[PDB]
């Protein structure tokens, strides 16, 4: 693997970043093609490139693209890449959209508040790791139920919207033993959250709207924060009066209540919610398309393990007796990473390598990985583009080191020293509980997709039951 100069150009300083941007957003093939075609052009899985949002919202579009499993890892190595204000990318949503504070996600582990706010989050999870399983069944048994009636009523039932309401219902319930739909928020949190997240991510979001609408309105400037302000407080009011326990630990940690509430609100609405809004529909999708031997076996495993080890109910012991169910949730996480882009700014002059070359990285350069590609490396995973349910079963467990949806080997856990998903163990559980509940009710199901910028736009059409 010879030392080579990283291929790719940045072109003229203003025109290029804009032109590429348009390519990234409207070129036939989507952003996936933006990378694949460059991978092909330079016969390299590591190359130079501009990345949105470019122009006025971003002052530095220049990055180095990582597309292979060999190089991609450097991004986890916090000893070499910095993780300051790049949670999104080459731009950071105005702080006005987050209480004036720079929330946890944007902090480098070398920042005291990082370890502080992360522990605060570790408390919120642990301190609620007892309502998770109970409160989950309760919320999705509301959901499937609600979906069952809507099905027989008109033939089909959309999953996405309802699923999000349940998601936020389940989060409040567990994290704070609260049903938000019993407060002023009503069943209208998913909308508040979207409206708010849109303001933040607007510069790098493709809503599938005409380029002559998206470019002027969403991709050249930042949206006036004052507009969202009203909506943001509606969510702020909720968290402030329900996150009491967690709001106290924040003081015990040296963090003010106000700043804490803004970080809690972010973690629950942006991190948690934003992620499940995507992962669940896709997981329900990949399984759905798997056929029936999966369904029949998934329902078989879950129930058997529920009797044998759960005594007639879901428990951590029983889950550990669901090898297929575990692998399934992992595969979903491998085949379609809910949060694709990982960034890292080089702190020193070091070297990295692809499957067939080496490259010099200089202090100050931004490294960018497109995970969906890296986790689909044929040199690592067989029939990569396929969803193999039992891929991580048996000796497959040894590949977990390669599942990076949480910004790090699935075989590792989040710490204050790293930038790995704080709710890592949390999502793996609830995504299993998701699949677990599903088949603990249905012997099988069928579904038809639909396109959307979110991902699946799933609608159910059939639902065999137990008994
Ligand atoms: C399945 C849903 C979720 C997905 C896909 C997801 C994904 C991610 C990713 C990719 C990062 C890395 C960002 C970076 O580049 O620096 C991240 C960070 C983070 N996530 Fe999540 N996440 C999910 C759920 C959650 C939940 C439920 C929590 C709540 C406790 C959470 C808390 C965090 C925190 C606190 C960080 C930053 C930690 C740090 O500063 O080191 N995430 N998440
Ligand atoms: C490439 C951006 C990655 C963001 C990862 C983050 O976890 C996402 C959070 C929420 C995403 C969904 C936000 C709404 C997307 C649809 C457009 C806005 C809306 O109407 O909801």
Swiss-Prot record:
InterPro entries in alphabetical order: Cyt_P450, Cyt_P450_E_grp-IV, Cyt_P450_sf
The keyword Lipid metabolism belongs to this UniProt entry's keyword annotation: yes
GO molecular function: allene oxide synthase activity; heme binding; iron ion binding; monooxygenase activity; oxidoreductase activity, acting on paired donors, with incorporation or reduction of molecular oxygen
Binding site for (13S)-hydroperoxy-(9Z,11E)-octadecadienoate: 194, 277
Residues involved in heme b binding: 83, 114, 118, 419, 421
Pathway info: Lipid metabolism; oxylipin biosynthesis
One Gene Ontology term, aspect cellular component: chloroplast envelope
Catalyses which reaction(s): (13S)-hydroperoxy-(9Z,11E,15Z)-octadecatrienoate = (9Z,13S,15Z)-12,13-epoxyoctadeca-9,11,15-trienoate + H2O; (13S)-hydroperoxy-(9Z,11E)-octadecadienoate = (9Z,13S)-12,13-epoxyoctadeca-9,11-dienoate + H2O
Required cofactor(s): heme b
EC number: 4.2.1.92
Broad EC category: lyase
Alphabetical list of SUPFAM superfamilies matching this protein: Cytochrome P450
Keyword Lyase: yes
Stretches of the chain forming a coiled coil according to its record: none
One annotated GO biological process: jasmonic acid biosynthetic process
Key words of the record: Fatty acid biosynthesis, Fatty acid metabolism, Heme, Iron, Lipid biosynthesis, Lipid metabolism, Lyase, Metal-binding, Oxylipin biosynthesis
Functional note: Cytochrome P450 enzyme involved in the biosynthesis of oxylipin jasmonates, important phytohormones acting as growth regulators and signaling molecules for plant defense. Functions as an allene oxide synthase that converts hydroperoxy fatty acids to unstable allene epoxides. Catalyzes the dehydration of 13-HPOTE ((13S)-hydroperoxy-(9Z,11E,15Z)-octadecatrienoate). Also catalyzes the dehydration of 13-HPODE ((13S)-hydroperoxy-(9Z,11E)-octadecadienoate).
Family as reported in the entry's similarity comment: Belongs to the cytochrome P450 family.
Protein name per its UniProtKB record: Allene oxide synthase CYP74A2
Gene name in the database record: CYP74A2
